[PDB]
Design a binder for this molecule. Structure first.
Ligand SMILES: NC(=O)c1ccc[n+]([C@@H]2O[C@H](COP(=O)([O-])OP(=O)(O)OC[C@H]3O[C@@H](n4cnc5c(N)ncnc54)[C@H](OP(=O)(O)O)[C@@H]3O)[C@@H](O)[C@H]2O)c1
Ligand SMILES: NC(=O)c1ccc[n+]([C@@H]2O[C@H](COP(=O)([O-])OP(=O)(O)OC[C@H]3O[C@@H](n4cnc5c(N)ncnc54)[C@H](OP(=O)(O)O)[C@@H]3O)[C@@H](O)[C@H]2O)c1
Ligand SMILES: C[C@](O)(c1ccc(C(=O)N(C2CC2)[C@H]2CC[C@H](c3cccnc3)CC2)cc1)C(F)(F)F
Ligand SMILES: C[C@](O)(c1ccc(C(=O)N(C2CC2)[C@H]2CC[C@H](c3cccnc3)CC2)cc1)C(F)(F)F
Lengths: 262, 259
């Protein structure tokens, strides 16, 4: 049930929200936009040094409140207590933004199984664990889940096999879960975010000299809109060529066709 | 780059082939077809009992050779040793059919993270391990990798989350790997197989009274035909609406866009 209107800041006012991989890039921006709305926000990543700043600056921007908890999403235990600790900190939760990933470079896959396992653990599994942990709270506030994926998670590219495997997984898993929430009349929206190339330090470090990326600041924003407006998918890619084709009716058809079937 | 000519059982004769999850269902059928064709075959799964039955039956259908090695794909050391032992049993390798999955059922997902983790380990991760271990031989023989997937690996159904996540994963990882072989000019084809409901013991059991399945023996042959013709994708379903609906050109186009 996507909402029948457009988005304005107030919708996030005093809304308790989690953001992962929020110490830099798209994550951080999302945190900043979030403050500019006066929402409550807890943020996480590994490094406490950078998290301290994000927290400190979100207050300036006017967040109702802002805190961090550091730990590696390599660690399902941490991911599970993180959500408990944060949500109890804020006495509830309205929107879960799953954004972090393990460190990846661009290269040929070359028998790097350990890196495929780690990608799958951090980028994909941890999202599930995180969701599991928040479901009870999200049911409470008829909240929302937002999952940051890529183009590389809808179609193929070389140089990101592990990465892509994991991004594809999110789609399969969370799109499947939606249909399940529907038929169980569970009212938690789930938004998958197909993002083209974005101007983050990390991304630009690997590209730039292979060329163009969309502005990180707006990306963060569109993500936030799609999530608040409870939309199934959000696309954000600089080239309007792309944004119009990615869609895929054969699937929407095939899914819906086999829905009223049972 | 797919061969541009019909296929003939003559294409698989003397071809040395591994088939995983071949004790029952689609995998068994595949082993049988390959035997009718005179290929060499090594099959695997956990149950030695059922495997013996298969092998023995394969030697009677005419396989150039036919061995088996039982093990769980839950164990990456076994996966890696399998391919070695098999390479030696056949002195090389022409095709690798990744077909096994972990047991599953149709159920709402609450918090079975260990099942999600096992699915990803067995239905996905082992394929990578297997692929990595077989790639050298396959290189030697300009061979093929055949990965068996589903509609649920291309579109979302309720009741199969873990399963889907893993099948989707195969698409992302193998389709991406396909691109890399092309820019590396590695001559080893990769075929992803998208199947609809098939009348295997397990499937029929599971969807007993909640949902027409295709014949598993014809399916088994399509898969092999797609592999030997080096097709990127095979689509097999009882509903021809479906088989034709699934192809995804808006995607093949997009991919070429940034290429
Ligand atoms: N930017 C792009 O070109 C692009 C394109 C498509 C999709 N996306 C998606 O957008 C999201 C963010 O991208 P980005 O470029 O903004 O990333 P980024 O700026 O490089 O930041 C990555 C974040 O994840 C954290 N992280 C790394 N390892 C972690 C771990 N083991 N446990 C917990 N956190 C960890 C990092 O903090 P620590 O190092 O301190 O842990 C950092 O905060 C990702 O989901 C990505 O897939 C990005
Ligand atoms: N049948 C369908 O409706 C359908 C639809 C779409 C896609 N597919 C795909 O087609 C393929 C085969 O399906 P199927 O229905 O033929 O399956 P199946 O008959 O149930 O056979 C599964 C095989 O995998 C083996 N296996 C199970 N757990 C294992 C483990 N831990 N380690 C190693 N092997 C294990 C089983 O033998 P052991 O228990 O002895 O190990 C068995 O040989 C799968 O990739 C499936 O996803 C099937
Ligand atoms: C983590 C990282 O920053 C990263 C990973 C994946 C994507 C990503 O989602 N892609 C955009 C959405 C498609 C990639 C862009 C570059 C593409 C590429 C790289 C090299 C060669 N050909 C294509 C791969 C997909 C962006 C950044 C990386 F890889 F370190 F740069
Ligand atoms: C292993 C198993 O036998 C199985 C799993 C998945 C699929 C599969 O790939 N599907 C076909 C390709 C789509 C399923 C068909 C039924 C679908 C479904 C289930 C419940 C309600 N509506 C549709 C779920 C995917 C087939 C068998 C199972 F799950 F035990 F039944």
């Amino acid at each position: 049930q996507p909402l029948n209107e457009e988005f304005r800041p107030e919708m996030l006012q005093g809304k308790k929200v989690i953001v992962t991989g929020a110490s830099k890039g798209i994550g951080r921006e999302m945190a900043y936009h979030l403050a500019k709305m006066g929402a409550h926000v807890v943020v996480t990543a590994r490094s406490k040094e950078t998290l301290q700043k994000v927290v400190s600056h979100c207050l300036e921007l006017g967040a109702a409140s802002a805190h961090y908890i550091a730990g590696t999403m390599e660690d399902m235990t941490f991911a599970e207590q993180f959500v408990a600790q944060a949500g109890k900190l804020m006495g509830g939760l309205d929107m879960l933004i799953l954004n972090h990933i393990t460190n990846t470079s661009l290269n040929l896959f070359h028998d790097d199984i350990h890196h495929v396992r780690k990608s799958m653990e951090v980028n994909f599994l941890s999202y599930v664990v995180l969701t599991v942990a928040a479901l009870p709270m999200l049911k409470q506030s008829n909240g929302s889940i937002v999952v940051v994926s890529s183009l590389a998670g809808k179609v193929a590219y070389p140089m990101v096999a592990a990465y892509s495997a994991s991004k594809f997984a999110l789609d399969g898993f969370f799109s499947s879960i939606r249909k399940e929430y529907s038929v169980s009349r569970v009212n938690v929206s789930i938004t998958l975010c197909v993002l083209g190339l974005i101007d983050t330090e990390t991304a630009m470090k690997a590209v730039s000299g292979i060329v163009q990326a969309a502005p990180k600041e707006e990306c963060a924003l569109e993500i936030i809109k799609g999530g608040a407006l409870r939309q199934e998918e959000v696309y954000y890619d600089s080239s309007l060529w792309t944004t119009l084709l990615i869609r895929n009716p054969s699937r929407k058809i095939l899914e819906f066709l086999y829905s009223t079937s049972y």
